[PDB]
RNA sequence: CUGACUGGGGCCUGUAGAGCACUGAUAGGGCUAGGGGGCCCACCAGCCUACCAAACCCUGUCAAACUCCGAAGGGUCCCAG
RNA sequence: AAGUCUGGGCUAAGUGGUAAAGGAUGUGGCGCCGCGAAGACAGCCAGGAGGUGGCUUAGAAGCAGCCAUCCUUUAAAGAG
RNA sequence: CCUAAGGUAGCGAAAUUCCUUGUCGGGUAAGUUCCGACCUGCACGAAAAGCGUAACGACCGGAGCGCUGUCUCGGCGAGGG
RNA sequence: CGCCUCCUAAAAGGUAACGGAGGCGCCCAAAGGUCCCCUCAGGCGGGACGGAAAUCCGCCGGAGAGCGCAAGGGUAGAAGG
RNA sequence: CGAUCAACGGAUAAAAGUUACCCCGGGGAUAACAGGCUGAUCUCCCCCGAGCGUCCACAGCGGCGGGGAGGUUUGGCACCUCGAUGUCGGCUCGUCGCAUCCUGGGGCUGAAGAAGGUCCCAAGGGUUGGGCUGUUCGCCCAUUAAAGCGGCACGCGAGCUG
RNA sequence: AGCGCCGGCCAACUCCGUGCCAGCAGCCGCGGUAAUACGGAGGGCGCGAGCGUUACCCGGAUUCACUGGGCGUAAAGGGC
RNA sequence: UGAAACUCAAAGGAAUUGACGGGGGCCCGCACAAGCGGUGGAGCAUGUGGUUUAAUUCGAAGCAACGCGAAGAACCUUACCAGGCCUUGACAUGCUAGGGAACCCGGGUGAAAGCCUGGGGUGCCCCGCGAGGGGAGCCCUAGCACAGGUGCUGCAUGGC
RNA sequence: GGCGACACACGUGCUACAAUGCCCACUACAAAGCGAUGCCACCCGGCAACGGGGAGCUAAUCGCAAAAAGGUGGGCCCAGUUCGGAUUGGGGUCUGCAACCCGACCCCAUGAAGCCGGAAUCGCUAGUAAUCGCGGAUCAGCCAUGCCGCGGUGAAUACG
RNA sequence: CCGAGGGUAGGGCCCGUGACUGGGGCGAAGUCGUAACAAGGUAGCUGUACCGGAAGGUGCGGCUGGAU
RNA sequence: GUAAAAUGCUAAU
RNA sequence: GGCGCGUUAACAAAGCGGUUAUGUAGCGGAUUGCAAAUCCGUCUAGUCCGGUUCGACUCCGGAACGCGCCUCCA
């Protein structure tokens, strides 16, 4: 878990053009926070507002031990500022909503062919004496979960066993591959959810030059060496008091 | 009387088998380009390697279109039955 | 139709009279060392202990997993 | 990028859908057929017309009620053989 | 689908399969005749630009180069320059 | 001198399709059905023992490889049949095999009991009714001791259906 | 002896805490680091074995207008 | 002909003062036009963004921030970083305890800071020819109130 | 020690890219200021930066001081040059307790980019723009090519 | 005979519920454009018609609640 | 009958 | 399975035996209160393996992946 390589999806909240811009600045916030680990960032999708900001970041931490320290960051981040799309010298409430997820894996598919069945019979439709007669039709029927796949395509069973294998995989990767994602989906509204002012995580309010994690209470007062990418004491501070969420009895 | 077949005599051949000298393949070891890693330096290079490995060398092998070799036979001419 | 013919051996499976990897105190014949009255082998009679566990582990402590396997009364007792 | 130009309205697993008994809903104790939906239409589509449509049909589907020797499952009787 | 080279082809010749691999449908006025000279690839060392390889010098080097183009045979005591 | 007369011994100077509306002469010299040979594929059984099973290779399992049996699948071949060997499924009627679905007898069990797992013996008997589809097959409903799998020209059209 | 209330309506104010969070809310609205508007305290205002809230009826609503309204441009003259 | 659910705390009419118009009219400004020299390219100077940095102190941000605060950064300046001292502290005063100093010339020891050392001499009155004892600038250590902050809010502010 | 960093980018400027110019020697004409550990005459050592002397001036008196463009004479002849002066090497001067990062000036050698600048863009309407030198403040020395001043020479053009 | 009710068949109205489907209200931020408010950069609005991702556009006729 | 090159700017008294 | 075609950078898509393809983007600049539009500039290349050639993104031979077509008579 907190030793395999790390992605984190930065996004973009309430505030229109400058949520997207304070995205940016949390994006280079954690990737000039990488080389005060050693880590590794490697950018995989952005989406560059053209006011210099960014609507969706998504960059890996590849480096032992990521998920160990980044964890704490998924969640909604508020800015409340002056911002420069403003022009009433106005405070304006802003979110960005960060999500952090492990690499997981790539790995392939195969057909454990002792929980599949295959099924052989006489081919419905044309063919006269030959289809008749010739089991040219294949019916694979995978046991563990029922579903069956259906093939007298052409005339050989050797050729209609592997197209219907074929699409048993290819419909079996389908289903694997969908609650993938509904377990990467479900994730993200337990760390993003609606986004909103509210759920905050961290507010990084300019004009007091203050940064709160409100979850446990920890205030800095370094706005600039916190957003330059110092956020090591505000892990620490979480880290201590992630313990003492474990006092038992 | 020249025949099939047969005796002797010469010449032609590259298979069976075997071999590795050529063309390729090939395990391991030795030796040793270049690369990988490599304590480290980029002022300038060195040194390590139970790390992939060129070539060369040893041990050990593979081949219809490889042969330094190479039968048994086969063919042909001459004399004779 | 012609030997229930002669001499030597093997098989006990009706093998002969339908097949493979492999498995086996089936049976016979060759061997190669080994151990034996310095009483062997088999059985029985005993001793098979002890500092007693070193890691695992709240026991796993002579009989889970790990480390090499130190030594005494001795004819021999393996931290098994 | 290419084309002469890139399928409009309406309809769609269809007398059209390969995967297919697609998925969902209805009906059934149970429905590869049926009806209603959905739309990645393998491979609808506008006078080889498109979508509807009262009435009509010895056309072809699906369901129910009534009633039965069709059937459970066969019995007997009649006449022509 | 005709033609050439190798193999299959069982050491003369020949020998099949929708067997295994490749090539030809050109070209050269010199890439032809003759006379006369000359000899390679590759390895080491050395040498401005200049490198793995341009040209130059030494030593070793029988043919592994070259012979317009496939392949085989042939070949420096030349068919090569 | 004019040839991709390249289908390259070169029919004409000059030439594409379709037939389920079809026809005649021939072929089991040659395909589709069934049989036969074969057994790659198919189904079943073994060998090895890496590993699993808290512990423990083998209760139950068996990496990577190895050996077979059968003749139900899909094929390969083209040997009788093209002067005809009627083809799917259903119905009806059975009979056989046993690699056994149930019932009878066992051993092992990671078998307390009950109930299962696994292997061995056993072919006497038995192995239901329905929805869907032409279906074989399969899925589903309600039951069951059980709802076996195969051969017989994928049994059976001079027995029926179509 | 308790209950409501003290931003305006509407009678009754200061202190810390909080920092668009927690929360108040009948309407207008409060809260984002000096909140008489949130939570506590002190103080205050109003009633009193009660105080508040919820539901419903009439009023305020001349906002169905008989009393006692309107229809050029606010809703409202019928196309003639 | 003609609703309801749900939803908002408004939807509206006229008119007022503004602002605005790719409305109008009438004026003006190196605003264009008319000219003259430049900048944008080069090398250096300087300020700044950015990256880097242990720190590269901070403010200024279109015109109206950018040779601007800064009309003079090697130390100082200096607000930043590193390391070593500091402890009523550099400074203000007032409250005490021991001294009783004041101030001036050396020794270490450290990079200096600072920490440990070694000398002398104090007025005001007195009892005074007395030992010398007090009051008493100022000085030091044990405590005191309190200092200090270029740390933050120019979205609490004056002043400029 | 940093504020002076350097893959880059922007603003503000100096110096340029030549002959209406560069160079050298000689001869002119300002204004505003400033100056008692201050300005410094003049003399001499030093190619120089400077040094050692050393008057005069609390300063319309003494000095900074040379103004420079300008003028006379002579030269370089159209070239990355007798244009341009960056970069680097070596030798020194001074300030300052102290000059590595990181100062300024002098001398010798080096002699860069740059041939008049794309899209674009700034100033200036008369003693103005252009061009030329001088002074001041801050200041130990200075990275000032900056700021505020000061005089010298001295245009073009406004139809609208 | 009538007759509570039971039964059979066909009607009507109401309620709830339904795969899917139509738009509507709402939202401190999203994507596309910019139709209207200035002559809003094509004066606007209008009924109707045809068309287009979308606001809309265009045709015909009307209004001024348009302009100088 | 006059009369136009040119789109946009969220959200805190 | 058979036959034909194809693989180029950020995307899409071209020519070619020896050599800035091209459009849009992306990066630096200009313009703008800012952004878009626009204007000045600028930039990343040929799927793997083996042949041919002096030289291969370009030619030949294979693999891999994508597209298109065919898979009929029983
Ligand atoms: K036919
Ligand atoms: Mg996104
Ligand atoms: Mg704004
Ligand atoms: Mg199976
Ligand atoms: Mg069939
Ligand atoms: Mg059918
Ligand atoms: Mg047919
Ligand atoms: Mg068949
Ligand atoms: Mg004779
Ligand atoms: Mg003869
Ligand atoms: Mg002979
Ligand atoms: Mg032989
Ligand atoms: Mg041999
Ligand atoms: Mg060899
Ligand atoms: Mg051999
Ligand atoms: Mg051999
Ligand atoms: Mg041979
Ligand atoms: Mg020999
Ligand atoms: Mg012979
Ligand atoms: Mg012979
Ligand atoms: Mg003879
Ligand atoms: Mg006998
Ligand atoms: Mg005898
Ligand atoms: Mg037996
Ligand atoms: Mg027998
Ligand atoms: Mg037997
Ligand atoms: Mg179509
Ligand atoms: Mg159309
Ligand atoms: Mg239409
Ligand atoms: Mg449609
Ligand atoms: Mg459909
Ligand atoms: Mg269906
Ligand atoms: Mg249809
Ligand atoms: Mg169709
Ligand atoms: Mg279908
Ligand atoms: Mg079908
Ligand atoms: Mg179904
Ligand atoms: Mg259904
Ligand atoms: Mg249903
Ligand atoms: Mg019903
Ligand atoms: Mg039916
Ligand atoms: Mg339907
Ligand atoms: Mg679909
Ligand atoms: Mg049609
Ligand atoms: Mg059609
Ligand atoms: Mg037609
Ligand atoms: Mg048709
Ligand atoms: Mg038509
Ligand atoms: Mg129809
Ligand atoms: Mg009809
Ligand atoms: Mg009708
Ligand atoms: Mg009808
Ligand atoms: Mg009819
Ligand atoms: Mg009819
Ligand atoms: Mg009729
Ligand atoms: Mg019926
Ligand atoms: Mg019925
Ligand atoms: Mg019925
Ligand atoms: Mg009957
Ligand atoms: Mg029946
Ligand atoms: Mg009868
Ligand atoms: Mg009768
Ligand atoms: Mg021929
Ligand atoms: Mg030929
Ligand atoms: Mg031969
Ligand atoms: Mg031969
Ligand atoms: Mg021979
Ligand atoms: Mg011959
Ligand atoms: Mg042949
Ligand atoms: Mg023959
Ligand atoms: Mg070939
Ligand atoms: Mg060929
Ligand atoms: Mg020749
Ligand atoms: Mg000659
Ligand atoms: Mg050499
Ligand atoms: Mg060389
Ligand atoms: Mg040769
Ligand atoms: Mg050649
Ligand atoms: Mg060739
Ligand atoms: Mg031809
Ligand atoms: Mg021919
Ligand atoms: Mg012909
Ligand atoms: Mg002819
Ligand atoms: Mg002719
Ligand atoms: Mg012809
Ligand atoms: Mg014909
Ligand atoms: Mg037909
Ligand atoms: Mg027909
Ligand atoms: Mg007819
Ligand atoms: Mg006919
Ligand atoms: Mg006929
Ligand atoms: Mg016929
Ligand atoms: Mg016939
Ligand atoms: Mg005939
Ligand atoms: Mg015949
Ligand atoms: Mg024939
Ligand atoms: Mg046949
Ligand atoms: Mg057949
Ligand atoms: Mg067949
Ligand atoms: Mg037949
Ligand atoms: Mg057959
Ligand atoms: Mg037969
Ligand atoms: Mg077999
Ligand atoms: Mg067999
Ligand atoms: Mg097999
Ligand atoms: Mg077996
Ligand atoms: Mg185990
Ligand atoms: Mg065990
Ligand atoms: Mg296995
Ligand atoms: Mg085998
Ligand atoms: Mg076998
Ligand atoms: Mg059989
Ligand atoms: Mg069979
Ligand atoms: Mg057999
Ligand atoms: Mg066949
Ligand atoms: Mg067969
Ligand atoms: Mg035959
Ligand atoms: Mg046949
Ligand atoms: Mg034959
Ligand atoms: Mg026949
Ligand atoms: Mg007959
Ligand atoms: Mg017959
Ligand atoms: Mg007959
Ligand atoms: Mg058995
Ligand atoms: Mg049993
Ligand atoms: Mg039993
Ligand atoms: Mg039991
Ligand atoms: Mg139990
Ligand atoms: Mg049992
Ligand atoms: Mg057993
Ligand atoms: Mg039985
Ligand atoms: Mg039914
Ligand atoms: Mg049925
Ligand atoms: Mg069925
Ligand atoms: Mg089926
Ligand atoms: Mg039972
Ligand atoms: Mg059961
Ligand atoms: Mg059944
Ligand atoms: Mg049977
Ligand atoms: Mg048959
Ligand atoms: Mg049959
Ligand atoms: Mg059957
Ligand atoms: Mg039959
Ligand atoms: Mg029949
Ligand atoms: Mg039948
Ligand atoms: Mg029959
Ligand atoms: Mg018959
Ligand atoms: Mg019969
Ligand atoms: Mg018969
Ligand atoms: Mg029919
Ligand atoms: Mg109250
Ligand atoms: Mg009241
Ligand atoms: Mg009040
Ligand atoms: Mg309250
Ligand atoms: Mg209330
Ligand atoms: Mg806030
Ligand atoms: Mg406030
Ligand atoms: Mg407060
Ligand atoms: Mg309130
Ligand atoms: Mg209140
Ligand atoms: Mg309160
Ligand atoms: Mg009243
Ligand atoms: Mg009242
Ligand atoms: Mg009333
Ligand atoms: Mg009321
Ligand atoms: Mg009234
Ligand atoms: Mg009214
Ligand atoms: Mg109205
Ligand atoms: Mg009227
Ligand atoms: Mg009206
Ligand atoms: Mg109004
Ligand atoms: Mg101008
Ligand atoms: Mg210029
Ligand atoms: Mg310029
Ligand atoms: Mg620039
Ligand atoms: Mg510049
Ligand atoms: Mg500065
Ligand atoms: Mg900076
Ligand atoms: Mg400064
Ligand atoms: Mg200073
Ligand atoms: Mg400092
Ligand atoms: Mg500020
Ligand atoms: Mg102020
Ligand atoms: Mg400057
Ligand atoms: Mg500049
Ligand atoms: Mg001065
Ligand atoms: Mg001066
Ligand atoms: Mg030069
Ligand atoms: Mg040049
Ligand atoms: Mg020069
Ligand atoms: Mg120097
Ligand atoms: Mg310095
Ligand atoms: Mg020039
Ligand atoms: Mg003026
Ligand atoms: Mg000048
Ligand atoms: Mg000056
Ligand atoms: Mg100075
Ligand atoms: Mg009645
Ligand atoms: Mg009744
Ligand atoms: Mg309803
Ligand atoms: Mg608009
Ligand atoms: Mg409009
Ligand atoms: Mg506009
Ligand atoms: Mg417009
Ligand atoms: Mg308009
Ligand atoms: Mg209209
Ligand atoms: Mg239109
Ligand atoms: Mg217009
Ligand atoms: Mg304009
Ligand atoms: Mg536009
Ligand atoms: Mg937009
Ligand atoms: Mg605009
Ligand atoms: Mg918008
Ligand atoms: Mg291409
Ligand atoms: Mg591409
Ligand atoms: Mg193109
Ligand atoms: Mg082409
Ligand atoms: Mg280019
Ligand atoms: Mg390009
Ligand atoms: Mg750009
Ligand atoms: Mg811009
Ligand atoms: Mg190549
Ligand atoms: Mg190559
Ligand atoms: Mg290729
Ligand atoms: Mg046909």
Same mark, same amino acid.
């Given at each position: 878990?907190?030793?395999?390589?790390?992605?984190?999806?930065?996004?973009?909240?309430?505030?229109?053009?400058?949520?997207?811009?304070?995205?940016?600045?949390?994006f280079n916030m954690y990737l000039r926070f990488?080389?005060?680990?050693?880590?590794? &960032?490697?950018?995989?999708?952005?989406? *560059?507002?053209?006011?210099?900001?960014?609507?969706?970041?998504?960059? @890996?931490?590849?480096?032992? #031990?990521?998920?160990?320290?980044?964890?704490?960051?998924?969640?909604?981040?508020?800015?409340?500022?002056?911002?420069?799309?403003?022009?009433?010298?106005?405070?304006? =409430?802003?979110?960005?909503?960060?999500?952090?997820? *492990?690499? +997981?894996?790539? @790995?392939?598919?195969?057909?454990?062919?002792? @929980?599949?069945?295959?099924?052989?019979?006489?081919?419905?439709?044309?063919? #006269?004496?030959?289809?008749?007669?010739?089991?040219?039709?294949?019916?694979?029927?995978?046991?563990? =979960?029922?579903?069956?796949?259906?093939?007298?395509?052409?005339?050989?069973?050797?050729?209609?066993?592997?197209?219907?294998?074929?699409?048993?995989?290819?419909?079996?990767?389908?289903?694997?591959?969908?609650?993938? +994602?509904?377990?990467?989906?479900?994730?993200?509204? +337990?760390?993003?959810? &609606?986004?909103?002012?509210?759920?905050?995580i961290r507010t990084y309010n300019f004009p007091?030059?203050?940064?709160?994690?409100?979850?446990?209470?920890?205030?800095?007062?370094?706005?600039?060496?916190?957003?330059?990418?110092?956020?090591? *004491?505000?892990?620490?501070?979480?880290?201590?008091?992630?313990?003492?969420?474990?006092?038992?009895?």
């Amino acid at each position: 878990m907190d030793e395999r390589d790390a992605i984190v999806e930065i996004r973009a909240g309430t505030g229109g053009e400058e949520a997207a811009l304070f995205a940016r600045d949390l994006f280079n916030m954690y990737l000039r926070f990488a080389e005060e680990m050693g880590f590794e &960032t490697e950018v995989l999708d952005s989406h *560059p507002t053209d006011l210099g900001g960014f609507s969706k970041v998504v960059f @890996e931490v590849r480096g032992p #031990g990521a998920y160990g320290t980044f964890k704490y960051e998924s969640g909604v981040h508020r800015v409340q500022r002056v911002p420069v799309t403003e022009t009433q010298g106005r405070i304006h =409430t802003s979110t960005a909503t960060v999500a952090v997820l *492990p690499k +997981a894996e790539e @790995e392939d598919f195969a057909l454990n062919m002792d @929980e599949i069945r295959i099924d052989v019979m006489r081919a419905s439709g044309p063919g #006269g004496q030959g289809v008749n007669t010739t089991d040219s039709a294949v019916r694979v029927v995978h046991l563990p =979960t029922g579903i069956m796949v259906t093939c007298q395509d052409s005339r050989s069973q050797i050729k209609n066993r592997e197209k219907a294998l074929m699409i048993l995989r290819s419909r079996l990767l389908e289903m694997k591959r969908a609650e993938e +994602a509904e377990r990467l989906r479900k994730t993200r509204l +337990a760390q993003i959810g &609606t986004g909103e002012r509210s759920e905050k995580i961290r507010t990084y309010n300019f004009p007091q030059s203050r940064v709160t994690d409100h979850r446990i209470g920890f205030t800095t007062h370094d706005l600039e060496g916190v957003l330059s990418g110092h956020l090591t *004491p505000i892990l620490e501070a979480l880290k201590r008091a992630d313990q003492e969420r474990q006092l038992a009895a």
